[PDB]
Amino acid sequence: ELRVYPGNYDEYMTAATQARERLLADNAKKKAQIAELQSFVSRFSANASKSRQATSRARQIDKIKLEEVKASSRQ
Amino acid sequence: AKLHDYYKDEVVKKLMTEFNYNSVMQVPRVEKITLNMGVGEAIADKKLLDNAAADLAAISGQKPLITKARKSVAGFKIRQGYPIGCKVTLRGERMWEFFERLITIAVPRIRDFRGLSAKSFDGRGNYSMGVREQIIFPEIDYDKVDRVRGLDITITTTAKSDEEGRALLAAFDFPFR
Amino acid sequence: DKKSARIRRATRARRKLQELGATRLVVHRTPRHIYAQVIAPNGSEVLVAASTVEKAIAEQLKYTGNKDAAAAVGKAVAERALEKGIKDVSFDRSGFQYHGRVQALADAAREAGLQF
Amino acid sequence: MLQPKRTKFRKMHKGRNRGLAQGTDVSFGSFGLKAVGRGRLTARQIEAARRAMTRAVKRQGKIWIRVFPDKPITEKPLAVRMGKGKGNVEYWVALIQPGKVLYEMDGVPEELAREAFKLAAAKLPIKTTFVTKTVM
Amino acid sequence: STRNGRDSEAKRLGVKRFGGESVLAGSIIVRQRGTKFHAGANVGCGRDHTLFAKADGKVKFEVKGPKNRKFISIEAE
Amino acid sequence: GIREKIKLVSSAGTGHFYTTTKNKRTKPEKLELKKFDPVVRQHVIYKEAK
Amino acid sequence: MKKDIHPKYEEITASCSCGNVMKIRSTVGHDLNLDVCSKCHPFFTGKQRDVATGGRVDRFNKRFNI
RNA sequence: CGCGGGGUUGAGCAGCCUGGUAGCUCGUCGGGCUCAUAACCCGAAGAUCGUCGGUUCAAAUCCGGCCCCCGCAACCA
RNA sequence: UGCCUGGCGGCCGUAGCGCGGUGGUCCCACCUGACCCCAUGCCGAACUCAGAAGUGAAACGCCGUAGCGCCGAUGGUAGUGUGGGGUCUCCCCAUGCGAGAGUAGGGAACUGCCAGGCA
RNA sequence: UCCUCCUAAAGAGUAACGGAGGAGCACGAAGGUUGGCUAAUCCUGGUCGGACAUCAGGAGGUUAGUGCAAUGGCAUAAGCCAGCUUGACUGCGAGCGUGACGGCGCGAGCAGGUGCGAAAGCAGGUCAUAGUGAUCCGGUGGUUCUGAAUGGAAGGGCCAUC
RNA sequence: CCGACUUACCAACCCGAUGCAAACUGCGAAUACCGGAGAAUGUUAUCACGGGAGACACACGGCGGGUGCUAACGUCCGUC
Ligand SMILES: [Mg+2]
Ligand SMILES: [Mg+2]
Ligand SMILES: [Mg+2]
Ligand SMILES: [Mg+2]
Ligand SMILES: [Mg+2]
Ligand SMILES: [Mg+2]
Ligand SMILES: [Mg+2]
Ligand SMILES: [Mg+2]
Ligand SMILES: [Mg+2]
Ligand SMILES: [Mg+2]
Ligand SMILES: [Mg+2]
Ligand SMILES: [Mg+2]
């Protein structure tokens, strides 16, 4: 799509690079906050005293829905 | 043409008295000539098949039919429908003309020619032969060609045995052993 | 077999006329003669048959077995059929391509009052 | 231990075992060990009853085994409740009907086979009998 | 164990009007999957190879054919 | 899913349309078919436009 | 034939280098002169002329001038 | 035999991120510099991308099956 | 009225396969030629047209042959409905139905409506 | 949730945390019609060419093939090519099958207009069975059916559709 | 190099014989089910429409089975 950044060119560069590394960072913040939730769900799952708690976040794992990363047209 | 009426006038009588037949058309007669080659290397260079088809069109006055792989085989990395070979079927006047022009000039032009084998029959009077190179034919100028591609001539006769096929082909001055 | 292929070329067309229950005009062609007979929907008994082997047809014909000879028997089968009251038949083919002598056999019979 | 290789289906129904057997004659050999009872006869009771009679005849003579298990018998593990799927295959048995000719042997005098077949009939759950080839 | 326990609803196939029954035109005779019984006289063949009557009468099963194929036919009696 | 939905609008002036599906990524090309148009009661040409 | 998908075809005089006039139809576009045909091919005359590669005792004897 | 993560050069790793170039750092070898060894400069060698099949013109990449290794789970009165 | 040949069916292996022989007056087949009507993802090979020189080789029909395919009893066996019984994860009795495989054997078809040639 | 086989006891149906596999599609031709054709796999002969490419004869005969899992089917081919095309068409529908219902399915034939074929004829999607979700609430196109004093209009209704 | 001599070996396709199969069939019952006709017997026992319900936790035994260990007064179906 056509996304307009107010800037001459060196503001556009530091905007469209920072706002892409921010996309990667805010996606890694989900990809790594799913990991330890899955560690809990994989460890205390069959345990009778903590199964109701493992199943509480095994369902918040699948309600996170990380945002996809597209491919740049420049190669 | 010349070979056809030579057959009619002489070979019928010769074979009739040789085998003691009882009918005019019990003598074996050649029914077709098939010239083909499976180029194989048309997997990646489709122009090679066109060049081979042009070679066959020059050799015999027909447009070759391009033959495609019947069944996918993983050994040669081909699958169904890939154009693989070219084939030409000659019957009648053209068959006789090519029959004359092969065994009169093209076979003599074979480098270090010694003789065609006599035990190269499929057991039913049919003959097969590999020319091993397309340059010998007079239809080629030795400079247009680019490869060593060779044909596979197959003479299909109505003979009932390889013995009668040998007799029929030796009645036509074939260079056997 | 050059004849088994033909006999199985016309089976689908033949077996539909048994299901429709329609009188059919089968056609047989040979390199020397050409026959044409009208067969009831029963399929086991014939009503009218004309052919080029009859002495009353081939005697005034130059050569039996060509287009103008087919038109000579196509005329004959149409007069005999109309004489017994058969008018609405269907054309069988028996595997022969509807292009040559059979076409003139059908066209001549069509022109003589037969409806198909 | 006899067991089929590359069988179509992993687990098979229990089924029933009714009727009389088919291979009731001594065809390959001369003396046979014909079954008289009924019941499955597994793959270890075949080898255990085979070694016992390829050793009582030293090593000479031919021996034919006319049965093959080809029947997977599952078994639920220990301390597992019922349900939750069929158990896994543990051994293979050959269903035997009264009349089946289990083993037969040739190339030995009769009184040697009649003793070798006695040391094999003691490893089989089912009753057995000694039968001799006949003219038919 | 597990990874099983699936099946489909029964399709209620089979012969609906057995031999000798009086049918009305358009009444289904057999519901098929292939063509086990072929269409004979005065019966049709739907897109599911369903054989339906075409003129009212008595059903009749036959074994006509060089390949011994079952044919369902109807006599307007 | 992958096959998107398209409607063939009649070219007889009246507002009529058959609705079908078309694989929308092989090449952009409108469907031209001659289909019955009940409003005018004739067989006209149907060009597609969603 | 099938109406101009084929190359041309015509009679061309193909005689040997030792006479042997042979009118043969072909598709070249020019008359050609070539070697002998099988009529005058050296096949039945050089059967032993070809099998001659050999001989060392004979060429050693001529070296034995003494 | 239930659930995950991996197999790329002698070692540790990318590239798999939506298919079209076998790469990084150590290391091995042959020269040079030195009295000599290290350091340094020049040149080079290798691998079936675990194996076996699959669509693709083309697969380390996408799909299926198998093998190997490393972890986790197999509950409470 | 008999024999042969061609077409269209009934019938479906007791009807098909193999082996030996035999048929050209007519029908049929192979066959001649191909510029033409028509066709070859090349080739009149197939389809098609224009005819008759030749042949019955191939094909087809007919006749003989059991070497295969095929059909197949009687008797017994298995199974099973109903009613009883047993040492009842399998059987028996009374009664009714009664296979499959196999054996003896049968067997290289029968037939109808037209149109030709011959006697 | 849906499809295929067995359990299912030779009509239909029939359960278990019983045994095995699939679907959430594809196609503007892979549909219609007309014309034509027959496969797998082995033997021999043959230039590169090998156990397997292509060619010629023989056996074999559907052991091949079917867009996709399994069952049933298929030579008159439902399998493989080619020409022309849009019936993958509108309003209906005798009579049936299957569901507790909601619903789903088969269908000759009638009317109007088409396609292929010389013609009899075939064509209301594909060899058949999976490839799918009701109502409410709204969006778009068409139709004076209605339009709260009257003429309009907004908004409702009906048909197509998201 | 060709293979030129060899191998106490393994061994596909076919041929003869012997077995096994719920998801095998070139065969194939008994029963059961559908339809037609006919006597006899049954206070219509059959169907359609309407007023009122209850019930949807079943158990055992015989025969055919799945699961289990052809174990359970175990569990899930079909028919009595
Ligand atoms: Mg049933
Ligand atoms: Mg039942
Ligand atoms: Mg299709
Ligand atoms: Mg067709
Ligand atoms: Mg089709
Ligand atoms: Mg389908
Ligand atoms: Mg108003
Ligand atoms: Mg309005
Ligand atoms: Mg309840
Ligand atoms: Mg309940
Ligand atoms: Mg119950
Ligand atoms: Mg209980």
From TrEMBL, chain B:
Extent of the signal sequence: none
The GO terms describing molecular function are: rRNA binding; structural constituent of ribosome; tRNA binding
Question: Do you know which InterPro entries this protein is assigned to?
Answer: Ribosomal_uL5, Ribosomal_uL5_bac-type, Ribosomal_uL5_C, Ribosomal_uL5_CS, Ribosomal_uL5_dom_sf, Ribosomal_uL5_N
Any idea which residues bear N6-acetyllysine here?
Answer: K2
Q: Which UniProt keywords apply?
A: Acetylation, Ribonucleoprotein, Ribosomal protein, RNA-binding, rRNA-binding, tRNA-binding
Query: Which superkingdom?
Result: Bacteria
Q: Where is the Large ribosomal subunit protein uL5 C-terminal domain?
A: 83-176
GO annotation terms (biological process): translation
| Residue ranges constituting the Large ribosomal subunit protein uL5 N-terminal domain according to the UniProt record | 23-79
Question: What does UniProt give as GO cellular component?
Answer: ribonucleoprotein complex; ribosome
What interactions and quaternary structure are annotated? Part of the 50S ribosomal subunit; part of the 5S rRNA/L5/L18/L25 subcomplex. Contacts the 5S rRNA and the P site tRNA. Forms a bridge to the 30S subunit in the 70S ribosome.
Tell me the function of this protein.
Answer: This is 1 of the proteins that bind and probably mediate the attachment of the 5S RNA into the large ribosomal subunit, where it forms part of the central protuberance. In the 70S ribosome it contacts protein S13 of the 30S subunit (bridge B1b), connecting the 2 subunits; this bridge is implicated in subunit movement. Contacts the P site tRNA; the 5S rRNA and some of its associated proteins might help stabilize positioning of ribosome-bound tRNAs.
**Entry's family note:** Belongs to the universal ribosomal protein uL5 family.
Record NCBIfam families? PRK00010.1 (NF000585)
Name listed for the protein in its UniProt record: Large ribosomal subunit protein uL5
What species was this sequence derived from? Answer: Escherichia coli O145:NM
Encoding gene, per UniProt annotation: rplE
